Design an enzyme around this catalytic site. Structure first.
Site, PDB file in Angstrom:
ATOM      1  N   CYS A 174       0.694  -4.942  -2.861  1.00  0.00           N
ATOM      2  CA  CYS A 174       1.820  -5.841  -3.064  1.00  0.00           C
ATOM      3  C   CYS A 174       1.480  -7.222  -2.513  1.00  0.00           C
ATOM      4  O   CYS A 174       0.441  -7.425  -1.880  1.00  0.00           O
ATOM      5  CB  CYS A 174       3.087  -5.285  -2.409  1.00  0.00           C
ATOM      6  N   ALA A 212       1.006  -7.347   1.226  1.00  0.00           N
ATOM      7  CA  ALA A 212      -0.325  -6.943   1.661  1.00  0.00           C
ATOM      8  C   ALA A 212      -1.315  -8.094   1.549  1.00  0.00           C
ATOM      9  O   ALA A 212      -2.138  -8.305   2.447  1.00  0.00           O
ATOM     10  CB  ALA A 212      -0.803  -5.745   0.842  1.00  0.00           C
ATOM     11  N   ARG A 242      -7.113  -3.170   8.867  1.00  0.00           N
ATOM     12  CA  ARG A 242      -8.154  -4.045   8.354  1.00  0.00           C
ATOM     13  C   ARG A 242      -8.983  -4.570   9.518  1.00  0.00           C
ATOM     14  O   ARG A 242      -8.435  -4.986  10.544  1.00  0.00           O
ATOM     15  CB  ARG A 242      -7.539  -5.199   7.560  1.00  0.00           C
ATOM     16  N   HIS A 255      -1.950 -13.911  -1.855  1.00  0.00           N
ATOM     17  CA  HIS A 255      -2.902 -14.949  -1.473  1.00  0.00           C
ATOM     18  C   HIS A 255      -2.349 -16.331  -1.791  1.00  0.00           C
ATOM     19  O   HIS A 255      -2.425 -17.253  -0.969  1.00  0.00           O
ATOM     20  CB  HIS A 255      -4.232 -14.743  -2.199  1.00  0.00           C
TER      21      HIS A 255
END
Ligand code: ICS
Ligand code: CLF
Ligand code: SF4
Ligand code: FES
Ligand SMILES: [Fe+3]
Lengths: 522, 121, 477, 130
Positions: free
Chosen positions: C59, C62, C93, C192
């Site tokens: 999504c 994320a 991560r 992003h």
């Protein structure tokens, strides 16, 4: 630089002199880091008691919580039925995160789908998404059942699953007889165990609501077992073994045992084992239904009592000695089968190990956290061992659970210095273990950081962690352990006593300083 | 977000303040301020809410998602050049012409122009 | 080879889908032809996922919180909304960093509003302000706050921009509201984009009216490197050994001060084009900072990128680059001589998020492996433009591949190694095929530079040539 | 090392070691005691020791040379004295292999966690997921 004979990963490659000089130059030049003395002073301030009282005055901020959202438990419950596909009506990020979580915990493939609702669904709803998703999933992955949960998005939008599934069936997207149970699992109510409860109640109501006319209690002479949100395969195994060794015919409902442990033999089995639909249809025919974790199966208990007309026993989780004894006695009472000699011998062996290790287990202070039933069973077992649970934490516990745990503690002389917290996160626990130091912690991998913090204060303030709970990411194959029953009690006892002995051995190892207590025999 | 509604039907352009990212779209903002953009459906296929949106602050342009329903409606109206489709598909940049019922308000200054006719002349 | 066989395999695989799903998924599977310059006529990307097909995409939350904003260490990131979203992304991560967690660094800690029913019904703006106050009292050394909004925040209509402005004015703090709701966008790419927009609009334009920082003609800024296992540090040592000065790091081991000081940089070195092309274009248009894409995967790509970066400065930088190449040549020559014969001729299949499927091709080819099938979850058409040339003819290309499609492609092709995420590792290990995690480096790394190439070769040799793969079948079966 | 081994056993173990590429750096000792093993682990440092409780001293010796030279011990064998209820474990068959694999991997992971628990020094490798 690297030597081809001895190649180093990030640790300890980044401990080299050139890398250290690079990092020092970077921090000095461009990071504008606070002075190290100021950082140490702030850390010491965070250690103290005034920081604790500032911490507990928190009402809007949560730091390092210990709980998940409902659709995770809903997916886990859906995974426990035969040829069933978990289907989450909402965004795809939820499903990706659920699959990553269960993959990292169980180290096994997890199958789940979503309709991937986007801004179009945000504006105009997601009924077309549900229709297309149901058709695509049935055509592609060929399941015998689709079990539908919801995300926070579908709950806020108000997307009602009943009308959507009925329309998808009526418009021909899926056959009208295809079983599609559903449940509303908002992420802002309760935690993952509430999602498991909602999903199980939804499935049970889907299968045992329109056919109450021909059901009579006790016809199949079986006992229904509802395990709840269980992340230990050993618990399913031990329940099955204990009921099979006694001659009781059972019907385990929603068991992901086989699908979460599949052999690697050159082929990938998307489905394996699971509760069969005819077992769910014949569930009200059973003599009674016993809930292994009653504190998060309240709605299931209400449905079973009010529709199946079963007198659900008031039992605790079969953890420790007394509660396992009560579980076995109640099962014997319901089924009429006596206790076999093997179970008595196992209980005797557990008592023998208890008496063997009581000398090392006595007077040890533990701070523990986890799910309500698991936490209360662990507290009871610790009180049975002579241990002192000083800090008890449960993020998803209610006031009735707190009252029950306090009543359990008050009935033993080892629970005098015990305080139960509900609604507190792991930052509160860090403050507690910094101001009132326990001997050990008992929890999932998220405690591994707290220990780290304690090590920054000094080796004499470090509180070692014991990994019992969900999720455990930093250790391999711990999900195969057993927690319930006699053998689960022995496993927990062995873990505790060996952790104590390992800590003592580590502390008493320095030559000519503390190795005079480095005894060969302990 | 500051939105300036302009139209030959309106004697004066109106300046309104809107909460960005609301589930209610530009259409909610238009309705609550009495701006008469012709809304003629509830499934977002008529195209009568076509408006021309200009980002007054060119620096503060926010990337968005152009849904397939909006794209198909805009093509059926004709207010979608191939270059703008390519720009929206590759750089995730909004087109010049939008649908008010399907447009989510972003945190920027916008000028919204409509002629009072349904999309498609 | 066997291009017609590849097309027939695609047609056979697409048969199980319904008509709509088959028609849509036919556009996303392609046979590579390196002579093609525009991917639009060959493959289609950046589209919504077909419902109920087990996509691997995430999504926008994320891609925004978990990818871009998360690695920043001295800021505090609030997962505004329910509790699960922050929990599942906590420390999942491996964006490495340096600092004392909980005092001056907060990378591996989960801050959340923990929305309840009353928060949904009434709103959480007052709760957000109270939370900001509690963060300020409890974590004084934090140098900034970012509020990453989840689905209910935009679904119930909360005004977090006004709260951010009010609290930032009151406490003289940098508060960045990010509208990264999961339903916005079809994958992490819009996350992003939204994170880059937030950085540009609330952070980047802060040290615009000051000139206290002393600039140097050799000033470069690393963009799009997130220090996964220490990759950014290897790249940094390689660049500093060339004589350049690295001022900023976006965003692995990154600080708010570095982000604010980035506009005073001569050259931007963009590693991840997909995630940080937006801010690089904005920087070039506003401050006039040129930006260029480089590759530090394997020795060949590393040397080529080093020479290309050196070509943008005077001759002293070129001589230092030649010195660095001469210094590091024997190490990777020895690594190749040791590991290539064990790995020569093996066929590898890849499926990663973005720009990693094409970047690691050179590293694999440096050890004699060949990539037979690659693809992306959320790359756009320009990424496919870039990756067509780097892949051999008659190879498989897939975008937003499903579990069924990937399983059938792997079964028919039978590759010797598969590099993908955690959600396919245990699927493909039970089929008797070696698997590598190409997102988290299988908890190893770094893989950038020559120091990373050594570890990469060792990891491939370890996983591919392991005895356990010879015992998948019982002797009596 | 095997104190009570013979020559035929040594030949068999050498044969089983030569059949696998991982036995290149392997040496079989018969008739040697734990002091020989102490010397061997001091001069040719392995990652871990496997044996009974008597090895705990050897580890201690290594720790006196330095933390970077410490060789941690895994208690699999007879006799185990400083640990409780380890005699209930399994070693033969698939279940025994499962337990041995779990013990080895978890010991490696605990050693890695110990090595990277230093704040701002080595905690960059203190991964939540391993
Ligand atoms: S940012 Fe992207 S999925 Fe470019 S969201 Fe993802 S640390 Fe991948 S292929 Mo995880 S577009 Fe980075 C990525 Fe690539 S998290 Fe990492 S490995 S180079
Ligand atoms: S797409 Fe992205 S990760 Fe998904 S919810 Fe949306 S912002 Fe978040 Fe977190 S809380 Fe649980 S997992 Fe979802 S259902 Fe509600
Ligand atoms: S342009 Fe013609 S067809 Fe279109 S709405 Fe107006 S009158 Fe009707
Ligand atoms: S109201 Fe008809 S398309 Fe918007
Ligand atoms: Fe496995």
């Amino acid at each position: 630089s690297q030597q081809v004979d001895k190649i180093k990963a990030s640790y300890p490659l980044f401990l080299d002199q050139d890398y250290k000089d690079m990092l020092a130059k970077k921090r000095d030049g461009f990071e504008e880091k606070y002075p190290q003395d100021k950082i140490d002073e702030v850390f010491q301030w965070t250690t103290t008691k005034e920081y604790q009282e500032l911490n507990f005055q928190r009402e809007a901020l949560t730091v390092n919580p210990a709980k998940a959202c409902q659709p995770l438990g809903a997916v886990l419950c859906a995974l426990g039925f035969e040829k069933t596909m978990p289907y989450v009506h909402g965004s795809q990020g939820c499903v990706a995160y659920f699959r990553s979580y269960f993959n990292r915990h169980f180290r096994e493939p997890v199958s789940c789908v979503s309709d991937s609702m986007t801004e179009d669904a945000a504006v105009f709803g997601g009924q077309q998404n549900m229709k297309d998703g149901l058709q695509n999933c049935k055509a592609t992955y060929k399941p015998d059942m689709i079990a539908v949960s919801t995300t926070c998005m579908a709950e806020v939008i108000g997307d009602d699953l009943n009308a959507f599934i009925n329309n998808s069936k009526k418009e021909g997207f899926i056959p009208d007889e295809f079983p599609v149970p559903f449940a509303h699992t908002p992420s802002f109510v309760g935690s993952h165990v509430t999602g498991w409860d909602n999903m199980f109640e939804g499935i049970a109501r889907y299968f045992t609501l329109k056919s109450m006319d021909d059901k009579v209690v006790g016809s199949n002479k079986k006992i229904n077992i509802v395990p709840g949100f269980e992340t230990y395969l050993g618990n399913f195994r031990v329940i099955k073994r204990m009921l099979s060794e006694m001659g009781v015919g059972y019907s385990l409902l929603s068991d992901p045992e086989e699908v979460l442990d599949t052999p690697a033999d050159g082929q990938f089995r998307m489905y394996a084992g699971g509760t069969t639909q005819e077992e769910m249809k014949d569930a009200p025919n059973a003599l009674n239904t016993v809930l292994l974790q009653p504190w998060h199966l309240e709605k299931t208990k209400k449905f079973v009592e009010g529709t199946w007309k079963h007198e659900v026993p008031k039992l605790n989780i079969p953890m420790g000695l007394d509660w396992t004894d009560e579980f076995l006695m109640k099962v014997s009472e319901i089924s009429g089968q006596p206790i076999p000699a093997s179970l008595t011998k196992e209980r005797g062996r557990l008592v023998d190990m208890m008496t063997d290790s009581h000398t090392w287990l006595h007077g040890k202070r533990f701070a523990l956290w986890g799910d309500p039933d698991f936490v209360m069973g662990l507290v009871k077992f610790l009180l049975e061992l002579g241990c002192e649970p000083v800090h008890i934490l449960c993020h998803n516990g209610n006031k009735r659970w707190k009252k029950a745990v306090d009543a359990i503690l008050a009935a033993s002389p080892y629970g005098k210095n015990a305080t139960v917290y509900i609604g507190k996160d792991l930052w509160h626990l860090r403050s507690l273990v910094f101001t009132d130091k326990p001997d050990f912690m008992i929890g999932n991998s998220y405690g591994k950081f707290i220990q780290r913090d304690t090590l920054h204060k000094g080796k004499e303030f470090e509180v070692p962690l014991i990994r019992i709970g969900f999720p455990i990411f930093d250790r391999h194959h711990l999900h195969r352990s057993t927690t319930l029953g006699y053998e689960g009690a022995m496993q927990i006892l062995t873990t505790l006593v060996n952790s104590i002995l390992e800590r003592l051995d580590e502390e008493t190892r320095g030559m000519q300083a503390t190795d005079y207590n480095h005894d060969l025999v302990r | 977000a500051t939105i300036y509604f302009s139209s030959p039907l309106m004697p004066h352009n109106k300046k309104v303040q809107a909460v960005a990212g609301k589930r209610s779209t530009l259409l909610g903002v238009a309705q609550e301020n009495g701006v008469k953009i012709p809304f003629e459906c509830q499934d977002g296929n008529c195209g009568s809410c076509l408006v021309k949106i200009t980002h007054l602050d060119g620096e503060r342009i926010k990337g968005m998602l152009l849904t397939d329903k909006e794209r198909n409606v805009l093509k059926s109206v004709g207010k979608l050049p191939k270059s703008e489709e390519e720009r929206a598909a590759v750089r995730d940049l909004p087109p010049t012409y939008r649908l008010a019922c399907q447009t989510i308000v972003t945190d920027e200054d916008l000028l919204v122009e409509f002629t009072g006719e349904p999309g498609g002349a | 080879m066997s291009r017609e066989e590849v097309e027939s395999l695609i047609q056979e695989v697409l048969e199980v889908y319904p008509e709509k799903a088959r028609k849509d998924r036919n556009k996303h599977l392609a046979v590579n032809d390196p002579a093609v310059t525009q991917s639009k006529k060959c493959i289609i990307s950046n589209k919504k996922s077909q419902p109920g097909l087990m996509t691997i995409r995430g999504c926008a939350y994320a891609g925004s919180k978990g990818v871009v904003w998360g690695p920043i260490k001295d800021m505090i990131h609030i997962s505004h909304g329910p509790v699960g979203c922050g929990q599942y992304s906590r420390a999942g991560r491996r964006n490495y960093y340096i600092g004392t967690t909980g005092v001056n660094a907060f990378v591996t800690m989960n801050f959340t509003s923990d929305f309840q029913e009353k928060d949904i019904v009434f709103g959480g703006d007052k709760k957000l302000a109270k939370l900001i106050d509690e963060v300020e009292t409890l974590f004084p050394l934090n140098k900034g706050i970012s509020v990453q909004s989840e689905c209910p925040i935009g679904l119930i209509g909360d005004d977090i921009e006004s709260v951010s402005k009010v609290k930032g004015a009151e406490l003289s703090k940098t508060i960045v509201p990010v509208r990264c709701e999961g339903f916005r966008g079809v994958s992490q790419s819009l996350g992003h984009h939204i994170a880059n927009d937030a950085v540009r609009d609330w952070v980047l334009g802060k040290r615009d009216e000051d000139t206290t920082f002393a600039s140097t003609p050799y000033d470069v800024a690393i963009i799009g490197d997130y220090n996964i296992g220490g990759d950014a540090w290897s790249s940094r040592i390689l660049l500093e050994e060339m004589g350049l000065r690295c001022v900023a790091q976006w965003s692995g081991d990154g600080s708010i001060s570095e982000i604010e000081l980035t506009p005073k940089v001569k050259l931007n070195l963009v590693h991840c084009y997909r995630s940080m092309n937006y801010i690089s274009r904005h920087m070039e248009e506003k401050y006039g900072i040129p930006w260029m894409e480089y590759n530090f995967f394997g020795p060949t790509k590393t040397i080529e990128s080093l020479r290309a970066i050196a070509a943008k400065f005077d001759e002293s930088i070129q001589k230092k680059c030649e010195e660095v190449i001469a210094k590091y040549k024997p190490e990777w020559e020895a690594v190749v001589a040791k590991y290539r014969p064990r790995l020569e001729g093996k066929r590898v299949m890849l499926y990663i998020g973005g720009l990693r499927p094409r970047h690691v091709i050179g590293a694999y080819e440096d050890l004699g492996m060949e990539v037979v099938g690659t693809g992306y979850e959320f790359a756009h058409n320009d990424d496919y433009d870039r990756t067509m040339k780097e892949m051999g003819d008659s190879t498989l290309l897939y975008d937003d591949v499903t579990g069924y499609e990937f399983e059938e492609f792997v079964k028919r092709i039978k590759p010797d190694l598969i590099g993908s995420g955690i959600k396919e590792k245990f699927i493909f290990q039970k089929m008797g095929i070696p698997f590598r995690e190409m997102h988290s480096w299988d908890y190893s790394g770094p893989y950038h530079g020559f120091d990373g190439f050594a570890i990469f070769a060792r990891d491939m040799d370890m996983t591919l040539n392991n005895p356990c793969w010879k015992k998948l079948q019982a002797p009596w079966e």
